[PDB]
Design a protein around this ligand. Sequence first.
Ligand SMILES: CCCS(=O)(=O)N[C@@H](C(=O)N[C@@H](CCSC)C(=O)NCc1ccc(C(=N)N)cc1)[C@H](C)O
Ligand SMILES: *[C@@H]1O[C@H](CO)[C@@H](O)[C@H](O)[C@H]1O
Ligand SMILES: *[C@@H]1O[C@@H](C)[C@@H](O)[C@@H](O)[C@@H]1O
Ligand SMILES: [Ca+2]
Ligand SMILES: [Ca+2]
Ligand SMILES: [Ca+2]
Ligand SMILES: [Ca+2]
Ligand SMILES: [Ca+2]
Ligand SMILES: [Ca+2]
Ligand SMILES: [Ca+2]
Ligand SMILES: [Ca+2]
Ligand SMILES: [Ca+2]
Lengths: 191, 254, 142
Amino acid sequence: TVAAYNLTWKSTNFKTILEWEPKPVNQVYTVQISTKSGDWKSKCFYTTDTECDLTDEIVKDVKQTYLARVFSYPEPLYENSPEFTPYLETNLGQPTIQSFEQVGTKVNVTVEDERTLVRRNNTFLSLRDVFGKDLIYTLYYWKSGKKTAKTNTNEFLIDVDKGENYCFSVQAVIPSRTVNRKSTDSPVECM
Amino acid sequence: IVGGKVCPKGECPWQVLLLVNGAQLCGGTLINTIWVVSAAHCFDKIKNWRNLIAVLGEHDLSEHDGDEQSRRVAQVIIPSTYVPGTTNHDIALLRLHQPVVLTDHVVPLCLPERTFSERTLAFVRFSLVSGWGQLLDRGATALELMVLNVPRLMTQDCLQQSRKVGDSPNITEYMFCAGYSDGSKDSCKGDSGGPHATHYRGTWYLTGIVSWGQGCATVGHFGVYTRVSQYIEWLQKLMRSEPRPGVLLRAPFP
Amino acid sequence: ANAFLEELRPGSLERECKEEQCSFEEAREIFKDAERTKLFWISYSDGDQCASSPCQNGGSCKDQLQSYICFCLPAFEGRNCETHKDDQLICVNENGGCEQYCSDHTGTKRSCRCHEGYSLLADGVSCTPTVEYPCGKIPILE
Ligand SMILES: CCCS(=O)(=O)N[C@@H](C(=O)N[C@@H](CCSC)C(=O)NCc1ccc(C(=N)N)cc1)[C@H](C)O
Ligand SMILES: *[C@@H]1O[C@H](CO)[C@@H](O)[C@H](O)[C@H]1O
Ligand SMILES: *[C@@H]1O[C@@H](C)[C@@H](O)[C@@H](O)[C@@H]1O
Ligand SMILES: [Ca+2]
Ligand SMILES: [Ca+2]
Ligand SMILES: [Ca+2]
Ligand SMILES: [Ca+2]
Ligand SMILES: [Ca+2]
Ligand SMILES: [Ca+2]
Ligand SMILES: [Ca+2]
Ligand SMILES: [Ca+2]
Ligand SMILES: [Ca+2]
């Protein structure tokens, strides 16, 4: 048998999947995940895939730091994964502009508060529910010269020259972050 | 024990105190009213085999009370593969001359089935190690029973996290590391033979025996305990066996 | 798209990319600028990865750039919600929910057991003491 390698974390909006190599040949795998002081919990028992969904385990506390390891079967051979702190590292999904109404010389741009995989009281918490004040939205717009706006909520109230048309784009952003601080630019919408 | 705390009288009821010629020798673990599990190296320099005593329900070596029960050790069974002075197969099964009385202060630790211990208990992060051993590396021993909660490590991690010491003992499949490498908490010499008890869903089980390690709470090193799971069958067979003439007995392993 | 003579008409996002599929060139004729055109094209042309209906067992698909995310129902998990949480009643999985011992069984379900001095309750997973001082229990705390 061969120990797994290149263990990587694929997480977006808390949908966290651990991947590795190589493509199993006469060997199956079993993953274990835990917090530094917690017990080890097994997942994806004797799977032949080179991935394992750990979303249900990590959403129990997104601010914890998890370690996972992939066991190999023909103590068993294994390989540890990088530590993973959901709250600090999960990528922000692509935003979606929910709408924008004009009011004379101003335009209110609303950013749809997308949902995450974090279950809470039989429901899915939004991006806002989880990050609260740590999440802001930035706006990249132009008179259909660049322009930008920022908001600590899900809406932008900006000034616009009456008559001319505008195009918008937004990015979810967690300023405090060091890595993965911004999501990809949302699709463009024009008034 | 280094970096631990006093085990409140009665909360470490399976702890055994082993004496030789009336002197403190090692720790042990009661697993039933007649048998005690300890470490084989605790007997490397024994000469008066008829002078081994096991004390149950102990707590404070400076004050006697009615919870103490003494029993002559009628037999010390060590694996045939064990070599005095070396680390492998550091286990011993002791038969008491007369059963001890189970009470609120004297209770046996459960000996688990092999697979249960391997597939479940082995992944329970924390476990308790205890004894009247040294409180500091090279320091003096404890008057009151001490206990410490230590985290378990798979050998690959232990090796990777332990700084290579010139020609140090291999951590075999009959061992496992547990403790901290920051030099603050670990068991020690005087705790040898003592239990490494794991708590699982309301019941405590025997998963290890204090065996060896680089000094006591040495930076870059972990404590090493005998992996009891590898001896379940060996122990059960002996406990159903007839007593032998002499005290010392070497039983084949496997 | 381009029909006979329509190109004589000025650009129109609605008429060309909204009410129709528009090539990169047509998009470029509406936005003009290079970056503006690109910022629009990455999403517009990305396609909907959720079109395959990948999220199984009643899951919900959320489209993303060249990928997706499945939101599963409580009793499911996995990238596509393919994993049945109720189909993991094996010993290695949390000791099969057994309080003490667990024994796997090919075909049938796993069976739980107990250590001497205890007995399996009618629930099939719990163990209770059959003696005054069972092993692994601390009297002054019970
Ligand atoms: C006290 C440390 C002595 S030492 O020289 O640093 N380490 C040796 C040792 O443990 N020897 C054994 C005896 C021969 S091998 C079974 C021993 O002392 N065992 C007692 C013991 C118990 C616990 C710990 C610990 N957790 N640090 C250390 C030693 C080993 C074999 O190198
Ligand atoms: C639906 O489309 C996505 C595109 O990535 C593919 O990954 C799925 O397998 C398919 O069902
Ligand atoms: C999308 O989310 C999943 C979990 C289910 O609740 C679906 O009914 C919903 O549309
Ligand atoms: Ca005393
Ligand atoms: Ca057209
Ligand atoms: Ca056209
Ligand atoms: Ca229209
Ligand atoms: Ca048309
Ligand atoms: Ca053109
Ligand atoms: Ca055109
Ligand atoms: Ca054209
Ligand atoms: Ca897409």
